[PDB]
């Protein structure tokens, strides 16, 4: 899912440090 | 903690439409330089008729977009917009007041299919219950598109054609839909079970966004505009304020756990304990989904106050410290209106009016 993966990014990003 | 009954979610309705007869303007365009795009109108002819009765599912935003994308191709081979000469009356539907709203300008016809395309969004984002990390994940990402939609239609389309799409409102729109997803987001970091530090930064940028939100819903002229909705939409939006700033401090309070600082513990779980309580007493009248998030939580906040302050009373004896001592909460934004791109060959297809010879 391309869209949620975008949206998901900054989410991602904070958690993995 | 993470088996909290959710909260509800706000979404808006879609604009109804009247006519945009824009065939007759077409065809007499066009005869002025044989038979006048006749096949080409009647498929925009069913893609509108499409739209404004649109399915309200995640197909039906596809439905959106593509009629969207068509009718900026339109626009760039027919003058359409204000003051143009093939111009026609568009007619909406303003929500709030139910009045019909007409302009003679095909971009007032672009920002109500983009008005209700973030609608949709807010829509489906609120259906799933979000128990499930995907469905935390899915009703995000809509929300994040609504806000998109709402966005992009606030700066490109600043004539503000009528009341229900003005820039305060639209502003609104954006931070109740930016909140909502950040506030799944604090869900999912819940089930994920990250590090109470960042849980609490996750749930205090909830709060922020929320407070844009009231504070837009506190404006007494933009108050009066809505009517009970603003009512209905800043119950649930001031309670949730506190009862995110509760989940912070809650989370603030483990951190202080985890680091052994058990005079900080007990003064972030009060904390939370008071905000808590402040919510409960706004949260009166509402439906038992807000009242089981609250009672479940408050069982919680409850118990792991009474521990810490045991704990500290009996054993470790340590200051509790004032809050305002203490480094606050930085909220942490995840989250932003997805760009909407109306000309994107992806979801529009081919120019319905492409002409060879």
Redesign the interface.
């Known amino acids: ?1 391309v ?2 993966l ?3 990014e ?2 991602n990003k ?2 993995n440090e | 903690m993470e088996a909290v009954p959710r909260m509800p979610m706000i979404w808006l309705d879609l604009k109804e439409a009247g006519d945009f007869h824009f065939q007759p303007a077409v065809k007499k365009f066009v005869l002025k330089a044989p038979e006048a795009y006749n096949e080409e109108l009647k498929k925009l002819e069913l893609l509108r008729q499409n739209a404004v009765r649109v399915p309200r599912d995640f197909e039906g935003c596809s439905v959106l977009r593509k009629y969207l994308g068509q009718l900026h191709y339109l626009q760039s081979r027919v003058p359409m917009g204000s003051g143009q000469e093939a111009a026609v009356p568009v007619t909406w539907t303003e929500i709030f007041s139910g009045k019909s709203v007409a302009h003679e300008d095909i971009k007032y016809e672009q920002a109500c299919i983009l008005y209700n395309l973030g609608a949709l969004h807010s829509m489906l984002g609120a259906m799933d219950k979000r128990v499930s990390e995907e469905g935390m ?2 009703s ?2 809509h929300f ?2 609504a806000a998109g939609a709402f966005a992009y239609l606030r700066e490109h389309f600043p004539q503000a054609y009528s009341v229900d799409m003005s820039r305060q409102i639209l502003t609104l729109n954006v931070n109740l839909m930016l909140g909502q ?1 950040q506030e799944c ?1 604090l869900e ?2 819940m089930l ?1 079970n ?1 590090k109470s530090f ?1 849980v609490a930064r ?1 749930s205090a940028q909830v709060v922020d966004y929320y407070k844009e939100a009231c504070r837009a819903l506190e404006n007494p002229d933009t108050a009066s505009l809505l009517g009970r909705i603003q009512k209905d939409w800043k119950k649930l939006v001031q309670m949730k304020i506190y009862y995110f700033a509760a989940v912070a401090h809650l989370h603030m309070g483990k951190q202080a756990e985890e680091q052994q600082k058990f005079g900080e513990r007990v003064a972030y779980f009060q904390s939370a304990l008071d905000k808590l309580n402040e919510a409960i007493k706004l949260a009166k009248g509402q439906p038992d989904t807000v009242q089981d998030a609250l009672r479940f939580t408050m069982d919680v906040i409850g118990g792991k106050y009474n521990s810490a302050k045991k704990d500290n009373d009996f054993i470790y004896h340590e200051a509790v410290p004032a809050l305002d001592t203490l480094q606050p909460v930085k909220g ?5 209106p ?1 760009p909407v791109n109306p000309t994107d060959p992806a979801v529009t297809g081919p120019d319905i009016f492409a002409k060879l010879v």
């Open positions: 899912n869209k949620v975008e949206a998901l900054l989410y904070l958690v | 994940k899915v995000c990402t994040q598109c997803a987001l999912k970091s994920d990250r960042l996750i942490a934004p995840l989250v932003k997805l």
